[PDB]
Design a protein around this nucleic acid. Sequence first.
RNA 1: AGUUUAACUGGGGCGGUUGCCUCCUAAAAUGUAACGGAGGCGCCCAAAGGUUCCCUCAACCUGGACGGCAAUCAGGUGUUGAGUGUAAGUGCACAAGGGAGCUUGACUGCGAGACGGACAUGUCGAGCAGGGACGAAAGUCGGGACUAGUGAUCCGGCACCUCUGAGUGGAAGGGGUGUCGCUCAACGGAUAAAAGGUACCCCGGGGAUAACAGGCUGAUCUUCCCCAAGAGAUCGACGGG
RNA 2: CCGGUGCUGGAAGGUUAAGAGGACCCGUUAACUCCCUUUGGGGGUGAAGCGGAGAAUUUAAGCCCCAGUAAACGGCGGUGGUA
RNA 3: UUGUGCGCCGAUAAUGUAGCGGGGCUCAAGCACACCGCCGAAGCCGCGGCAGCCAACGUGUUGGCUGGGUAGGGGAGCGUCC
RNA 4: GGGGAUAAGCUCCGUGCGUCGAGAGGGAAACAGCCCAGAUCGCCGGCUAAGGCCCCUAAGCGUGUGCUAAGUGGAAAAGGAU
RNA 5: UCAAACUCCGUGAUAGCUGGUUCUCCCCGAAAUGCAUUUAGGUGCAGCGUCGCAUGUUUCUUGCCGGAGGUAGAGCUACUGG
RNA 6: UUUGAAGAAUGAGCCUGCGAGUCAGGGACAUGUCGCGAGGUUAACCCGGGUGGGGUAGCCGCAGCGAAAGCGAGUCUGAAUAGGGCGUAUCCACACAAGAGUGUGUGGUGUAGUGGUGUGUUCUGGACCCGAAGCGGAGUGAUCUACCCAUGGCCAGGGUGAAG
RNA 7: GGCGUCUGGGGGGAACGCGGGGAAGUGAAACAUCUCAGUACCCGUAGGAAGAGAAAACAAAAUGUGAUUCCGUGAGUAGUGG
Lengths: 77, 49, 63
Amino acid sequence: SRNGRDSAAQRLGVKRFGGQVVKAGEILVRQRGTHFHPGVNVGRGGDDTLFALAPGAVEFGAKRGRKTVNIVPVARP
Amino acid sequence: DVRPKITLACEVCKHRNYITKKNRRNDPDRLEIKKFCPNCGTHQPHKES
Amino acid sequence: PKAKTHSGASKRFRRTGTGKIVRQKANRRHLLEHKPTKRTRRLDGRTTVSAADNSRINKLLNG
RNA sequence: AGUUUAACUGGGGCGGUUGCCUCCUAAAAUGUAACGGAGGCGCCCAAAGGUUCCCUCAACCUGGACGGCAAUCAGGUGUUGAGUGUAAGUGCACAAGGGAGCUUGACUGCGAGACGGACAUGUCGAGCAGGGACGAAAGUCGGGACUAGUGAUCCGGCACCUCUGAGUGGAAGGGGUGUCGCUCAACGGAUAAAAGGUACCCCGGGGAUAACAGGCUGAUCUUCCCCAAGAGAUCGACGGG
RNA sequence: CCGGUGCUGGAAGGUUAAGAGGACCCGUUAACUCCCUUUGGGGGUGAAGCGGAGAAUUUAAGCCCCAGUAAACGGCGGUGGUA
RNA sequence: UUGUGCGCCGAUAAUGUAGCGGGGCUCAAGCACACCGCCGAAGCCGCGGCAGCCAACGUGUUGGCUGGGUAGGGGAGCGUCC
RNA sequence: GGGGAUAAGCUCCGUGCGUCGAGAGGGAAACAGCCCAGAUCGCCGGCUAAGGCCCCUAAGCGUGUGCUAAGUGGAAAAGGAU
RNA sequence: UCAAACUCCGUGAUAGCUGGUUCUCCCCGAAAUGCAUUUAGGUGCAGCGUCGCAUGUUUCUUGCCGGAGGUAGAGCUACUGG
RNA sequence: UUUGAAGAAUGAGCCUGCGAGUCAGGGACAUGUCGCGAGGUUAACCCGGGUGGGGUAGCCGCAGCGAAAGCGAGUCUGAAUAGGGCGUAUCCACACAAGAGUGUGUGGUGUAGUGGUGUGUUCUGGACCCGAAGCGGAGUGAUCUACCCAUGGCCAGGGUGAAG
RNA sequence: GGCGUCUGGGGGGAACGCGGGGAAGUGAAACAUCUCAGUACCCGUAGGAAGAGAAAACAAAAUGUGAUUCCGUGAGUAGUGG
């Protein structure tokens, strides 16, 4: 039979969920398209990877119909 | 063949060489590109070798 | 008879000041055209040997 | 004369396959097998890369010399059904889709922090310095909408270095930095180098493992039966248990 | 049936080892020539000699090549129509 | 007629009853629904002995938990000879 | 859930699923993988689990209200059946 | 004794293979999975055991709260296919 | 040995003896224990009828970083005080910085190795024990059998009837 | 070449010596370079020991050692190696 070929699993998906505190540079989601769009303090990578630009807590929101990921600057002690 | 590996020696001596590929029939003539050269610390032109 | 140490391991592994075993990273001999400079930069230098290989490399180095 | 002549295989043989990418199986995190089901890759682009600015399709209707379903022109409807170099998927109309001007960041030294992971690999990355491109500026640029387009180590070649140089000065050779040479495609790569027969066979194991017999199931076989389209008590199709 | 592979015969050409040949180049330095500074090193040219890599040229069989050979190893066809 | 709780044919292979474990059972010892007892294990409790871990107070007692086990890891010992 | 004819006591995956493996004891007639329950040792004590209580065989030919005629209970379909 | 005799020696050849491996008790106690492999009955690393050290509940369970899914179900002039 | 065997998978007639993780090496790693301790220790050898005394050559600690030249509590990369890598036992206090995860300094505190020997693994040795078919070297065999060489022997009786 | 006459040799032996020739099993998880190993074995020769031995040597700028042999270190190091 022709079949029998497949590629490796790419382990995509969301890495940090709502409420998790993160450091700057931490990867938030691993996605192919822009399923989630960058929000505040969130950048987009070459492979459309979302990461944190500032420390804080992950917050999932919708902006003009697009699901977005933002970082909330948790209060200093 | 096509898009083979070609080398750009820094026109300003320095033996600074960048490498890249190009289609040898789309651009049969030698490639000329202005690139940063570390030891000189300036953007000098580079010629295909 | 005195123990004989492994030649290849002696050529491939080093020990730092506090006894850490240090190696060099692969994929940096040839075929460096299509590799971006960031990839070759992350492959530069030396790293410590992973915990899984520490026992085997220590055995290969000491004897 | 010394050796080699791979593995998978619902027992073997012919055949097919071996690496990477996309979807389903996959049971709404990740991951998940089958000689399970579908496809693609071993490139390409000197612009199809960078930047600045501008634009919005396809389809339908109406009207137009050739001209027609369908070329080019005009008006209207048209929110995405077009297109995105290339499979599929996730995206993209705010455009990542179409056009133009300048350009080479398809940089050098780096890199906090992470993802993924037996290990080796792999992946993302703000920010700092140098020197630039575009832009009034803010700013963006460490190739391409993203995910394939690839090969470790050894050995050797080439360029440069304020490294070394077997008494000394050199040189040879060695070293560092950049880089080149493998359908090593059996794609973690037993050698730089390798096909077959044995019914003349031998040895050691294995019912992992089959051959004959059983234990189970039933594609098939047979013993019947269910309704009755019919031919004409007897045969009973088409379907069914 | 001499197309294939062997075998036998023949070289007119192509290719081809060792050996002869040693152009050219490179290392070293007697000698000079520029410096650049002061309590002699830093650049170039460079004879001879000694070394190292060595090219053109010459060169046999073999192979390619030209023939013969099957009681040499081997081989010895399809399709359509027509009284 | 309609749905229903039990029933009947369908039902059917080759050593011997052989498709309740046997005898036997509808005067149920069968089924359904309520109710009351008892039997039943190395499970739990009772009484006694031992051991591991920990705790308390002490200069070894008490107490609380725990003590199936192959591959295997650790600890402590019996017997033999010189 | 896939492959196979959704056939296998077939095969391949997922499962803070179980047991066996490496688990004795009680029950299912017998019965690694099912049900109850995890054996430190002793007792001629008690209470229970699953499963049972006519006799084999420990404990009920238990009580009350109904059904079954087929030994149904104590194996099976389409379908047939005052 | 013959698809390469016999004897001694190399020699205690080599077998990812088969068999065997001897007293006791106490505590704990697996795995039959992943990746790679001239690999599939072997092995390396990881996963799971034990011992020592360090660290302390960081593990686990339940309640509440903040999150992302594209399964079951359903639906379809909301798309694509039949 | 197995997923699983009371056996219809394996082995064992019985008894008594015998029969399988050992040794070497200043080997390697870990962990006990003893001596000395910023030091520890000798090897060959020499002298003692011993197990004792001597023997400093070496070895391991005592500074690291770097390919190396080299520099050194720093060093490498780099144009860079500009970040990183490795190193400066560890802790404590005090400051000045930052809340991009903590850092930078000033004082104290002061750092532990090594040599015997026990045990568990490990390397090279046959290395826990047992077990091939076969492979090499040197020899032994044709009194069996295969063929050949020399020299001898044997083949009752009866038929048929070539050349000449 | 022959004849005569004198003086030697021949062979054995356990290990050790020197000079020549020289495997394969094995390891490399295959195998040919390589290893095994200049081993096993074989040939020629000794002596009480043998062999080597008196610089056409090292060394590295020290105004340095001073024939050979053997023992310990240097050192599993510098290196060398599909």
